Amino acid sequence: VGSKTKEGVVHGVATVAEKTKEQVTNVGGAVVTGVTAVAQKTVEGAGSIAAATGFVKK
Amino acid sequence: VGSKTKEGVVHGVATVAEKTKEQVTNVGGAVVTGVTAVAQKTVEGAGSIAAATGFVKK
Amino acid sequence: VGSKTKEGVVHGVATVAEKTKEQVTNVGGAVVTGVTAVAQKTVEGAGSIAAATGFVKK
Amino acid sequence: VGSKTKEGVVHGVATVAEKTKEQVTNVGGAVVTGVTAVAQKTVEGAGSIAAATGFVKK
Amino acid sequence: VGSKTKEGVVHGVATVAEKTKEQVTNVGGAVVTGVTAVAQKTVEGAGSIAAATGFVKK
Amino acid sequence: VGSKTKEGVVHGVATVAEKTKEQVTNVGGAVVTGVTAVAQKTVEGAGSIAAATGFVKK
Numbered sequence A, B, C, D, E, F: 001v002g003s004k005t006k007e008g009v010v011h012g013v014a015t016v017a018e019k020t021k022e023q024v025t026n027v028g029g030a031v032v033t034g035v036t037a038v039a040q041k042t043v044e045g046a047g048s049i050a051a052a053t054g055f056v057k058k
Helices: none
Strands: A003-018 A018-026 A030-034 A049-050 B005-016 B019-027 B030-036 B049-051 C004-018 C019-027 C030-036 C048-050 D005-016 D017-027 D030-036 D048-050 E005-016 E019-026 E030-036 E048-050 F005-016 F017-025 F030-036 F047-052
Touching: A003 E005, A003 F005, A018 A030, A030 A049, A049 B030, B005 E005, B005 F047, B019 B030, B030 C019, B049 C030, B049 E005, B049 E019, C004 C019, C004 D005, C030 C048, D005 F017, D017 D030, D017 E030, D048 F047, E019 E030, E019 F030, E030 E048, E030 F047, F005 F017, F030 F047
Parallel strands: A003 B005, A018 B019, A030 B030, A049 B049, B005 C004, B019 C019, B030 C030, B049 C048, D005 E005, D017 E019, D030 E030, D048 E048, E005 F005, E019 F017, E030 F030, E048 F047
Antiparallel strands: none
């Protein structure tokens, strides 16, 4: 009878990075460099998992 | 009877990167460089998983 | 009787990258470089998985 | 001038298995089930990376 | 001038297994079930990385 | 001038296992179930990294 329910889920992940140089040179604005294995289950809202959301104005 | 339900789900992932140089040189605006194995189950909202959402104006 | 339901789902992924140089040189605007194995199940909203959504205006 | 030399080498591997049942039912002899991403650089000898080498006799 | 030398080498590995049942039912003999990302650099000998080497006799 | 030398080497490993049942039911003999990310650099000898080496006799 048990109902098995799964939403916004990330599992069984195995990342391997090999980097000599990772440079981010930002001058103003917004930057989102690296996002791995993240989850969010929002209700009644504006959700942004990995988003550079620049409200740049005068 | 159990109903097995799965929504916005990412599993069984095996990433292997090999990078000598990863450079991001941003001058204003928005940048979203790398997104791997992410999940989001939003309800009643404007969802953006990996989006550079630049409201750049005067 | 159990109903097995799956929506916006990504599984069993094996990425292998081999890069000497990955450069992104952005001057204003929006950039979305790399998106792998992501999921989103939105309800009643405007969803953007990997989208450079530039509202660039004066 | 540097000489870059590589022998019996395995790199940049990303395995993803999804198995409900893996059974090995052996009755005597030799069994080698699973070998992934292995290396051996032998010198002056009889090398066997993944070999069922049964010397079965009376 | 530096000489970069690499022998019997395994690197940058990302394994992901998902198993409900892995059974090995052995009755005598030899069994080698699972070998991942191993290395051996032998000199003047008989090397066996993953080998069921059964000397079964009377 | 420095000579960078690497032999029988395993590095940068990321294992992820997900097992409900792993059973080994052995009745005599030899069993080698699981070997991950091991290294051996033997000199003047008979080396066995992961080997079921059964000298079963009467």
